[model samples]
Target: ERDCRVSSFRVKENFDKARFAGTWYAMAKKDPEGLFLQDNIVAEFSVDENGQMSATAKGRVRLLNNWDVCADMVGTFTDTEDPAKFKMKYWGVASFLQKGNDDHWIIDTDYETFAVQYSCRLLNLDGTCADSYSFVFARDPSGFSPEVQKIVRQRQEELCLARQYRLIPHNGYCNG
Candidate 1:
C-alpha cells in the first residue's frame, strides 16, 4: 500500500536557527510516570553565536527527586535555499539525533500511515532564511514508538554513515 515499511525518516530539511529554539516533545514515549521514571522528557532549544542549534532536555525520576539528568545536542543547518525544510544534525553523548534537513525539502511526507511530519512559520512570514520554526514527532506510543524508533533508527544508522554521535551518559538520563 503506502510503503509503510518505515523509510528511515530523518530531518529532511535544514535546521532553522529560529525554529530550532523553544520547546519540543517526543510526541510519544518521551517521559511517562513512575519512580526511576523519565516522564515527559521534553527539550528546550536555543541559538548560539555560531548560528547553531542548541538543545537541552532534563529527565527526572520523581517530583521531589527532580535532579534526574540533563543533556545537550549540538547541530547546524545544511546549505539549502528552501530554508523552511532543513536538516538538523544533533549529537549528544548519552543519545543523539543526527539527521539531514534537506531530505524533506525536495521529498514529500505522508502522515496517513505514520511518518515523521511537522510544520513551522516565521513570526509574520518574515521570509528571512535566517529565522523560522521546527518540530519532530515519532509515533511510538509504547516506550519504543514506531515514529521515534524510526528517528532513533535513522540516527543509529548514521553512526556509520555520519558517525558523529556517541554514547556519553555523563549524568545518565538523570540530571543529577
Candidate 2:
C-alpha cells in the first residue's frame, strides 16, 4: 500500500543530469505558500566540464510585499544519495532576487519531452509539507503532444495537486 506521507511518492528512476540538460518551459506550476515565480517562466539546465549541474531560470514575479520585477536566477545542484534528488543552491543574477537553498527533486521525467519537478520548502510538525511547489516542464514552449500531456496530467494527480495548472505565457521578458 502507498504511504500517506507525501515523501512516500516515487521519484524518477535513474535520473541523469547530463541527458536532462536543455531548455524547458514551465507549462504549469503549482505555487507554494509564498509568492513566487509567476507566468512566462523558463529554465535551462546544463552540466559543466566538471560534471556540475547548473540551471538558469527566468520569470516574472510580484513579491508579496510588492517588490515586483522580472527575475533572472541561477542555481547549482549537489547530488544526493538518491539519484533523483539534489540540494539546489540558487540565487538571482542581480542583488535583489530571491536566493536560498532548497531541495530539487525530479519526481518524473523522460529526459527530453516532459518533466515533473517537486520542491518542498517546509515541513510541518506532523511531517506533512507546509509549503511546496510542483512544475510541469515541456521541451517545447508551445505545448506538449497528446501522449506526453497525458503523462503530465497523471503525475499531477499523483502529487495531489490541483488539476487547474496555470499555463505559463512566454515572451521575450528575459531578453535585453
Candidate 3:
C-alpha cells in the first residue's frame, strides 16, 4: 500500500474567470517526462460573455526530432464541478506542433499577483502519477514579491514538487 501525499488539494475558492483573465508570465515550472516547452513561456487567458474560458500560450520548444521552434498554442477550457478545475483541449497554431487534452487546475491564485496551475498528463497503471506539469505565474514579467514567492513556495511544497522546478526566464522570446 502507498500513502498519499498532497493528492487531495484545494483550489482557489470562488474562482472568477473574468478576474483570472489577462496575461500571466511564467516565472518557473516543474516539467514532466519528455518535456517540450523550453522556456520564455507566456499564457493569455480570456473569458467570453457566455462564461467560456480560452487561452493562447506561447513558448520556445524543441520537437521530438530536435528541431527548435517558437510555438503558438491555443486551448479551450471546459469547466468542471469545481470552479477552479477545467478540461483543456489544446492545439498548436500549425500541424507541426504539439497538441493534447489535459486537466487544467488552478491550485491557488489571488487573481492579481500570482497563479499556480497544475496538469497531470498521464497516470500509471497502478494509479500513481506518470506525468505531470505545473506553472508558477506572475502578473508582471519582472518577478514576484517576497510575500507572493512564499505563497508559491508553500504551495509547491504542498504538491511535492518543490525541487522539480526550473526557473523560466522572461526574455521576450515569444515576441519574435
Candidate 4:
C-alpha cells in the first residue's frame, strides 16, 4: 500500500539549486485552501553566490468577482536538515496580494525536463496533510515528452494528488 503520511513522503536526493535555477512553466498544479494563482503560472529560480535560493513568479489571480490581475510573487527558501526540504517565505509584490510561509519540498526532478514540487501547508493529527499544494513544472512552456509525462504522473500518484491536479493554461495571460 502507498503511504500517504506527510512525514513519510520522499523528497529529491541532493537537490542542486544551481541546476534548478532558470525558468520553469507550471504545467499543472494542485491548489491549497484559498488558492491565489489561477493560471498562466511561471516561476523563475535563482541561486545566489552564497547558495541562497530564491524565486519570482507570475500568474493570473482573481481578487474579487471578475477582478483578475497578474500577480507577482517572490519567495526565499531557508534550508533545513534535508537537502530537498526548505521553509519558503513568500509574498506578493503588490500590497493586497496573498503572503505567507510554507514548506517547500522537491519531490523529484531530473534538472533537464521536469520537476515535481510539493508543499504541505497544514498537517493533520494523524500525520497526513490537511492542506497541501503541488506544482508540476517543465523547462519548456509547451509540455513534456510522453516519457516525462509518465514520470510526472507517477510522482503525482505518490503524493496522493493525482486526481487533484488541474492543468494550468499558458495563454500569455500574465505576459507584459
lDDT of 1 by residue, 32-127 (tens): 122222344455657777765445555433335454444444444453465534555545545432222322231222332222322222222333
* TM-score, predicted candidate 2 vs. hidden true structure: 0.90
Estimate, for each residue in 48-152, the C-alpha lDDT of model 3 and write its tens digit.
Answer: 999999999999997777777889999999998899999999999888777888999999999889999988778667554678899999998888889989999
- Write the residue-wise lDDT of candidate 2 on 3-42 in tens digits: 4356777799999889999999888888887667988788
Worst 10 residues of 2 by lDDT: 1-10
Ranking according to TM-score, highest score first: 4, 3, 2, 1
Highest-TM-score candidate: 4
The TM-score measured for candidate 4 stands at: 0.97
| Candidate 1, backbone clash total | 30
RMSD of each: 14.2, 2.0, 2.2, 0.9
Q: Local error of candidate 2 at 170, Å? A: 1.6
Each prediction's TM-score versus the true structure: 0.32, 0.90, 0.92, 0.97
Candidate 3: regions farther than 4 A off: 1-7, 124-128
**Weakest 10 consecutive residues of candidate 3 by summed lDDT:** 1-10
Task: For model 4, state the Cα shift of residue 18 in Å.
Answer: 0.3
Error (Å) of candidate 3 at residue 30 is 0.4
RMSD versus native structure for model 2: 2.0
Those runs of model 4 whose alpha carbons end farther than 4 Å from true positions after fitting are none
